[PDB]
């Protein structure tokens, strides 16, 4: 009379691809900046030469004044 | 003499999907700390040196 | 005595893939800004402070009792 059920169907389609990965970790902090350069002795002498000389001269005159 | 059979049982499930794509590369790290500022000591040392030099030059 | 049935329908889709791997770590940050160097004006200010702070030594070098 009535027929056997057919053979099993074809395998299903492969599943959907997984979700994208999470973003990577941030990098480490950069190295410290270089130290500030110190002024040379010649530069300091040039800038302060007259100042020191004037201060000494004024003081010298003041301390050897007569009343 | 009879009617044909039913459609067969549904097929087996498909394989697992391939793994997800790799994530975005991480951002660059923060900038490093600022370098040390030049202290006043190197200026003090020279200023003291000049003071002694010029005071001695008044002594002579 | 009846003919066999047609083959069944396509099966289920598979389970979704596992999540992707985390991305590469980022590169190191840039180096910090340099330390500041003294200006000409700052140098003069320091020098004037030193003169004031050692004004006593200066006076002593030029004038003492007797």
Author numbering:
A (entry chain C): 1 to 67
B (entry chain B): 2 to 61
C (entry chain A): 2 to 67
From the paper:
All five constructs were screened for crystallization, but only three of them yielded crystals of sufficient quality, crystal structures for 111, 211 and 121 were independently solved using the MAD phasing from selenomethionine derivatives (thereafter designated as 111sm, 211sm and 121sm) to 2.25 Å, 2.10 Å and 1.6 Å, respectively. Whereas the crystal packing for 111sm and 211sm are similar (two trimers per asymmetric unit), it differs from that for 121nat or 121sm (one trimer per asymmetric unit). Overall superimposition of all trimers showed some drastic deviations. The most deviated pair is the first trimer (chains A, B, C in the asymmetric unit) of 121sm versus the second trimer (chains D, E, F) of 111sm (r.m.s.d. of 3.01 Å). On the other hand, superimposition within the NC2 domain demonstrated high identity of the trimerization domain and adjacent residues within the triple-helical portion. Most of deviations observed for overall superimposition of trimers are attributed to distal flexibility of the triple helical fragments caused by crystal packing. Namely, a triple helical chain linked to chain B of the NC2 domain is always in the leading position, the one linked to A is in the middle, and the third one linked to C is in the trailing position. Despite the variations of composition (homo-trimeric for 111) and stagger (121 or 211) that might not represent a native stagger, the regions of sequences derived from type I collagen are well structured. Crystal structures of 111, 121 and 211 constructs demonstrated that a staggering order can be manipulated at least for short native collagenous sequences, meaning that such sequences are rather adaptive to various abnormal conformations.
